[PDB]
Scaffold this active site. Structure first.
Site, mmCIF file in Angstrom:
data_model
loop_
_atom_site.group_PDB
_atom_site.id
_atom_site.type_symbol
_atom_site.label_atom_id
_atom_site.label_comp_id
_atom_site.label_asym_id
_atom_site.label_seq_id
_atom_site.Cartn_x
_atom_site.Cartn_y
_atom_site.Cartn_z
ATOM 1 N N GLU A 23 42.500 56.439 90.037
ATOM 2 C CA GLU A 23 41.046 56.424 89.987
ATOM 3 C C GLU A 23 40.716 57.172 91.628
ATOM 4 O O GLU A 23 41.355 57.963 91.908
ATOM 5 C CB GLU A 23 40.313 55.091 89.803
ATOM 6 C CG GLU A 23 40.859 54.465 88.579
ATOM 7 C CD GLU A 23 39.933 53.355 88.104
ATOM 8 O OE1 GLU A 23 38.720 53.690 88.539
ATOM 9 O OE2 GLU A 23 40.218 52.758 87.291
ATOM 10 N N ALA A 25 37.372 59.016 93.791
ATOM 11 C CA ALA A 25 35.926 59.492 93.730
ATOM 12 C C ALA A 25 35.619 60.872 92.989
ATOM 13 O O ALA A 25 34.504 60.863 92.287
ATOM 14 C CB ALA A 25 35.440 59.813 95.314
ATOM 15 N N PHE A 26 36.564 61.716 93.020
ATOM 16 C CA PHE A 26 36.739 62.805 91.965
ATOM 17 C C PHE A 26 36.704 62.823 90.443
ATOM 18 O O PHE A 26 36.312 63.554 89.793
ATOM 19 C CB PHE A 26 38.009 63.822 92.324
ATOM 20 C CG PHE A 26 39.191 63.105 91.943
ATOM 21 C CD1 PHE A 26 39.716 63.278 90.308
ATOM 22 C CD2 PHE A 26 39.850 62.186 92.563
ATOM 23 C CE1 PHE A 26 40.741 62.575 90.114
ATOM 24 C CE2 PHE A 26 41.198 61.619 92.181
ATOM 25 C CZ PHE A 26 41.605 61.726 90.804
ATOM 26 N N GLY A 27 37.215 61.567 90.295
ATOM 27 C CA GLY A 27 37.147 60.947 88.756
ATOM 28 C C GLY A 27 38.581 60.165 88.508
ATOM 29 O O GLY A 27 38.934 59.354 89.430
ATOM 30 N N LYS A 28 39.316 60.568 87.523
ATOM 31 C CA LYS A 28 40.111 59.574 86.839
ATOM 32 C C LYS A 28 41.256 60.275 86.272
ATOM 33 O O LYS A 28 41.358 61.477 85.833
ATOM 34 C CB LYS A 28 39.754 58.784 85.901
ATOM 35 C CG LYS A 28 40.463 57.372 85.297
ATOM 36 C CD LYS A 28 39.619 56.446 84.447
ATOM 37 C CE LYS A 28 40.115 54.832 84.849
ATOM 38 N NZ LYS A 28 39.684 53.964 83.670
ATOM 39 N N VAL A 29 42.646 59.870 86.500
ATOM 40 C CA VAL A 29 44.018 60.513 85.866
ATOM 41 C C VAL A 29 44.504 59.407 85.021
ATOM 42 O O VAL A 29 44.740 58.071 85.229
ATOM 43 C CB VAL A 29 45.013 60.886 86.849
ATOM 44 C CG1 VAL A 29 45.971 61.425 86.343
ATOM 45 C CG2 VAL A 29 44.369 61.750 87.958
ATOM 46 N N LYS A 45 43.497 64.609 84.105
ATOM 47 C CA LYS A 45 42.645 64.516 85.269
ATOM 48 C C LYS A 45 41.267 64.776 84.560
ATOM 49 O O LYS A 45 40.827 65.701 83.982
ATOM 50 C CB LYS A 45 42.805 65.196 86.568
ATOM 51 C CG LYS A 45 41.789 65.304 87.687
ATOM 52 C CD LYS A 45 42.437 66.210 88.606
ATOM 53 C CE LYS A 45 41.726 66.399 89.795
ATOM 54 N NZ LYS A 45 42.690 67.403 90.837
ATOM 55 N N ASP A 142 44.342 68.654 102.013
ATOM 56 C CA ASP A 142 43.935 67.370 101.915
ATOM 57 C C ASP A 142 45.566 66.681 101.638
ATOM 58 O O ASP A 142 45.662 65.902 100.579
ATOM 59 C CB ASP A 142 43.336 66.992 100.717
ATOM 60 C CG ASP A 142 42.653 65.510 100.851
ATOM 61 O OD1 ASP A 142 42.940 64.972 101.820
ATOM 62 O OD2 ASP A 142 42.456 64.993 99.459
HETATM 63 N N1 FG9 Z 1 47.960 61.302 89.586
HETATM 64 C C1 FG9 Z 1 48.251 62.446 89.225
HETATM 65 C C2 FG9 Z 1 49.527 62.582 88.259
HETATM 66 C C3 FG9 Z 1 50.216 61.579 87.854
HETATM 67 C C4 FG9 Z 1 51.415 61.698 86.886
HETATM 68 N N2 FG9 Z 1 51.756 62.856 86.388
HETATM 69 C C5 FG9 Z 1 50.996 63.668 86.877
HETATM 70 C C6 FG9 Z 1 49.871 63.819 87.773
HETATM 71 C C7 FG9 Z 1 49.078 64.948 88.129
HETATM 72 C C8 FG9 Z 1 47.939 64.879 89.038
HETATM 73 C C9 FG9 Z 1 47.059 65.908 89.653
HETATM 74 N N3 FG9 Z 1 46.149 65.877 90.401
HETATM 75 C C10 FG9 Z 1 45.898 64.477 90.686
HETATM 76 N N4 FG9 Z 1 45.204 64.258 91.714
HETATM 77 C C11 FG9 Z 1 44.168 64.964 92.309
HETATM 78 C C12 FG9 Z 1 43.691 64.229 93.682
HETATM 79 C C13 FG9 Z 1 43.983 62.726 93.455
HETATM 80 N N5 FG9 Z 1 44.773 62.448 94.797
HETATM 81 C C14 FG9 Z 1 44.000 62.517 95.863
HETATM 82 C C15 FG9 Z 1 43.118 61.157 96.079
HETATM 83 O O1 FG9 Z 1 44.005 60.035 96.052
HETATM 84 C C16 FG9 Z 1 44.243 59.843 94.693
HETATM 85 C C17 FG9 Z 1 45.384 60.716 94.399
HETATM 86 N N6 FG9 Z 1 46.533 63.494 90.211
HETATM 87 C C18 FG9 Z 1 47.671 63.559 89.550
#
Ligand code: FG9
EC number: 2.7.12.1
Length: 338
Positions: A23, A25-29, A45, A142
């Protein structure tokens, strides 16, 4: 967004949500079963329905199209975007499913650090992946342990009653880099603020301008966090942040102090910081010269810390490049062939 991302919900008539991955601020995965790719698990995402996150995901999709096309085998370890779609007016980006973020892996083992052998493997891969962005006129901006993920679920975990949690032991430490919504091309406009505060370079704090070297700083902060199990710059506040840098890394170059228009933080050529206040005696007690965080005087620990210290060069013109970094003696052990 609560309304659109429950377990059992189906996206784009094929992606069945089975779990939440992350989770923020950008949203949810969310983890999804892809009923149109033989039930392959993927990550989607779901981007928060706001200007900020909409344009950042439009940019991220452009960056990934370019990285994935340039490096189709993912030799440089950037996550593969499979496609993107719109779901109740949210942008959704589909990705290959990776394992845990290095952040969640440390956090859920009670903030215990990674093994030196693992950190060497992970640092090499992070440096090779972000050097590829560097080669291709990009800065991530980032980098932080939440944005480095294990490729695989290549760990064992057992319930330890003594401490009432699962402990997870890493078998293979291979990683990829995620989140390109902040990644900025060399010729694009450069945001004043960038990075999560704890990984933010001194040139970003001081509004002196930035490019590829601010990523190197961030990696430096990641690596000591992997070595200790916690951030050496825990704080929310920039002046305290700068006091902690001074305690750990020595005084800031006078040219950076005198040049910055953030003159708020300073007084003549000093940080404007009552060292003798109870907040200053906190930082003092909390912080020591970098080399004193070493858990061993063993040469391999010396190699890592020499690299970390170069990554945390204050002057971004003097900061080590990832090109030079990949050649550091800390990595020699990876290149053994006799
Ligand atoms: N959590 C992610 C995955 C989990 C498992 N497999 C593939 C994934 C691909 C992603 C691609 N993008 C992002 N997140 C974008 C930014 C989020 N980050 C930064 C902020 O804190 C949370 C993690 N998360 C991802």
């Amino acid at each position: 967004m609560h309304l659109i991302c429950q377990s059992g919900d189906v996206l784009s008539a094929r992606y069945e949500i089975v779990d939440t991955l992350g989770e923020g601020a950008f949203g949810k995965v969310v983890e999804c079963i892809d009923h149109k790719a033989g039930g392959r698990h993927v990550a989607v995402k779901i981007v928060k329905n706001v200007d900020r996150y909409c344009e950042a995901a439009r940019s991220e999709i452009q960056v990934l199209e370019h990285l994935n096309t340039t490096d189709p085998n993912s030799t440089f370890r950037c996550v593969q975007m499979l496609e993107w779609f719109e779901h109740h007016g949210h942008i959704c980006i589909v990705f290959e499913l990776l394992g845990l973020s290095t952040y969640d892996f440390i956090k859920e083992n009670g903030f215990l650090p990674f093994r030196l052998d693992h950190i060497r493997k992970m640092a090499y891969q992070i440096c090779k992946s972000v050097n590829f962005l560097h080669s291709n006129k990009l800065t991530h901006t980032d980098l932080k342990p939440e944005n480095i993920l294990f490729v695989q679920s290549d760990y064992t975990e057992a319930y330890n009653p003594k401490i009432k949690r699962d402990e997870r032991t890493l078998i293979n430490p291979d990683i990829k880099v995620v989140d390109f919504g902040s990644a900025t091309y060399d010729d694009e406009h450069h945001s004043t603020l960038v990075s999560t505060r704890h990984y933010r370079a001194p040139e970003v704090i001081l509004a002196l301008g930035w490019s590829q070297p601010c990523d190197v700083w961030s990696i430096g902060c990641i690596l000591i966090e992997y070595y200790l199990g916690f951030t050496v710059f825990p704080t929310h506040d920039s002046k305290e942040h700068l006091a902690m840098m001074e305690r750990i890394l020595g005084p800031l170059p006078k040219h950076m102090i005198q040049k910055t228009r953030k003159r708020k933080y300073f007084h003549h050529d000093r940080l404007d910081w009552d060292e003798h206040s109870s907040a200053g005696r906190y930082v003092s007690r909390a912080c020591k010269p970098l080399k004193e965080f070493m858990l061993s005087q063993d040469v391999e620990h010396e190699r890592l810390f020499d690299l970390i210290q170069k990554m945390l060069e204050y002057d971004p013109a003097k900061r080590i490049t990832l090109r030079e970094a990949l050649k550091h003696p800390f990595f020699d052990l990876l290149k053994k062939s006799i």
